[PDB]
Design a protein around this ligand. Structure first.
Ligand code: COA
Ligand code: ZN
Ligand code: ZN
Ligand code: ZN
Ligand code: ZN
Length: 534
């Protein structure tokens, strides 16, 4: 099998030895940790005939030193692969408690600190071996790209390369430094996602908050509504025969759902750190859901910089949301603060293994502090839990409880008719919040964004699981954000028509304003320099 690549970087044996072997020596210097690894494992000295049935490809320091002196290593990645094979054998065969397993983890920490600067001075991304997390014996490997000039294999996630953005292929950073040419701009950014009044209100609120709270590490935050659509929730069959047939409740309740995400600039690239679905029941929706908003789902990835401000910005985003719908005319908001089930991710496909998933008491304090902040700034008038509120203006019927898609209470009520209910309600009081924000109709000024990927939380989880867009680390979150944003930019389902903001006519050729969010004067006629678009 043939392909062609003439100006490849090829390394002569001694260049490799001179560069690589200072790391193999940093492993030998580890005493006693390197001692079980200086020779090929001998199962007849150790009494473990299992071993060659479990470790199919042995490797050791000495074998690597041999290969490195013979020249058996053409590229540095083959060396790197062989030391990680050594470590992976040990980590596999021995129990996580044994001595050797821990020796290995020390050698590995040494190798990680030594091999990275070396591999980068040789013009590579790192010296790690990465594999994706297990899903549902084998693990899937991270992907590589080759520099069309070097031929040097790099980690696609390390260099953040994607052909859709850059279709003329991957070109290493240095070869571009001789090239004179810099990277051409990534146009698929979060900032360049279609703007909305809701999004603008939220990002405008957080960014002045972060400036008022000067921090050098913080980057800009972009908040984007990436989907909204009009849906209905049908009352389920038990409650169906008991109240819809009677005409006491409408058969279904219309609402608009919106999905919005926040991104922060970190190391000069977009990182998605927060995501949220909401349901908004307007002023034409029948009781009991009239003029109500509900927070369907809330998820987050803890890499916001700096850590000490992450939660405060999450609260402001939520708080900004309350400020926005209150002004548009909604009256009450509802939060179901229920923590995710064990193995279940909300929105993001692979949270960091060490991000604490909170207990419901912690989570309820969390929503409590956020709401207390909103009350203080006069955005919320006040808030109580579900039982104190139901009892406070009485209620005797199941039809007076707000009825939201996927919420707990519709399903408690469905289960109730086959085979006391106030007892079912009071047990979970603290987990369900009712928020009082405060008449003419509510009119949403934002248009509908049709986006199947974000039409509810399942499509994006599914797609990321297949494409391995994990959010398990900063580097992996950067890559998943990169690809998420390409999906939002290029496969949404919305197509855009252009109108003259002056003459109300459809425009093709037009003059577009240099400052304003979306302003296009037709040619047939504003205070800004304009350039010609479309
Ligand atoms: C709700 C959320 C956005 C708030 O995040 P947050 O402000 O960073 O705080 P959390 O409630 O996650 O945890 C904050 C602190 O408590 C700690 N903590 C959280 N859960 C813990 C647990 N199970 N045990 C011990 N400590 C815990 C964390 O380590 C963290 O400490 P730090 O400042 O040293 O890092 C986030 O937890 C999240 O995305 N939750 C997952 C899904 C969820 O909330 N459920 C569904 C919708 S509400
Ligand atoms: Zn790498
Ligand atoms: Zn190159
Ligand atoms: Zn700080
Ligand atoms: Zn015109």
């Amino acid at each position: 099998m043939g392909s062609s690549q003439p100006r490849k970087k090829i390394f002569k044996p001694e260049e490799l030895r001179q560069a690589l072997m200072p790391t193999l020596e940093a492993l030998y210097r580890q005493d006693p940790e390197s001692l079980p690894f200086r020779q090929p494992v001998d199962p007849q000295l150790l009494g473990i005939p299992d071993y060659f049935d479990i470790v199919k490809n042995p490797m050791d320091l000495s074998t690597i030193k041999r290969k490195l002196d013979t020249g058996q290593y053409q590229e540095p990645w083959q060396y790197v692969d062989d030391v990680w094979l050594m470590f992976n054998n040990a980590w596999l065969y021995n129990r996580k408690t044994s001595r050797v397993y821990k020796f290995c983890s020390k050698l590995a920490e040494v190798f990680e600190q030594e091999i990275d600067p070396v591999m980068q001075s040789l013009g590579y991304c790192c010296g790690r071996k990465y594999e994706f997390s297990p899903q549902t014996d084998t693990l899937d490997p991270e992907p590589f790209v080759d520099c069309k000039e070097c031929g040097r294999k790099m980690h696609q996630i390390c260099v953040l390369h994607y052909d859709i953005i850059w279709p003329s292929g991957f070109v290493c950073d240095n070869c571009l430094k001789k090239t004179g040419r810099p990277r051409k701009e990534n146009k698929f950014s979060a900032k360049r996602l279609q703007t909305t009044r809701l999004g603008n209100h939220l990002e405008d609120r957080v960014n002045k908050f972060l400036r008022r709270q000067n921090h050098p590490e913080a980057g800009e935050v972009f908040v984007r509504v990436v989907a909204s659509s009009d849906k209905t929730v049908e009352v389920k069959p038990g409650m169906k025969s008991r109240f819809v047939d009677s005409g006491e409740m409408s058969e279904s309740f219309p609402y608009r759902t919106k999905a919005l995400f926040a991104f922060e600039e970190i190391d000069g690239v977009d990182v998605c750190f927060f995501g949220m679905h909401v349901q908004e029941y307007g002023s034409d929706c029948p009781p009991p859901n009239t003029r109500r908003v509900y927070i369907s789902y809330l998820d987050s990835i803890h890499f916001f910089r700096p850590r000490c401000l992450r939660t405060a910005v999450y609260h402001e985003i939520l708080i900004g949301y309350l400020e926005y719908v209150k002004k548009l005319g909604y009256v009450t908001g509802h939060i179901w603060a229920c923590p995710p089930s064990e193995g279940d991710d909300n929105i993001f496909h692979c949270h960091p293994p060490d991000q604490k998933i909170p207990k419901p008491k912690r989570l309820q304090e969390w929503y409590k502090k956020m709401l207390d902040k909103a009350f203080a700034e006069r955005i919320i008038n006040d808030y109580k839990d579900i039982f104190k509120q139901a009892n406070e203006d009485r209620l005797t019927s199941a039809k007076e409880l707000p009825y939201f898609e996927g919420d707990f209470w519709p399903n408690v009520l469905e289960e109730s008719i086959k085979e006391k209910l106030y007892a079912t309600m009071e047990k979970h009081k603290e987990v369900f919040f009712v928020i009082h924000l405060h008449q003419p109709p509510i009119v949403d000024p934002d248009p509908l964004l049709s986006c199947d990927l974000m039409d509810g939380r399942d499509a994006f989880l599914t797609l990321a699981r297949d494409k391995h867009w994990e959010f398990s680390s900063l580097r992996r979150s950067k890559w998943s954000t990169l690809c998420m944003l390409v999906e939002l930019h290029t496969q949404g389902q919305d197509r855009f028509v252009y109108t003259c903001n002056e003459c109300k006519h459809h425009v093709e050729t037009r003059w577009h304003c240099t400052v304003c969010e979306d302003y296009d004067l037709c040619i047939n006629c504003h205070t800004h320099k304009m350039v010609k678009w479309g």
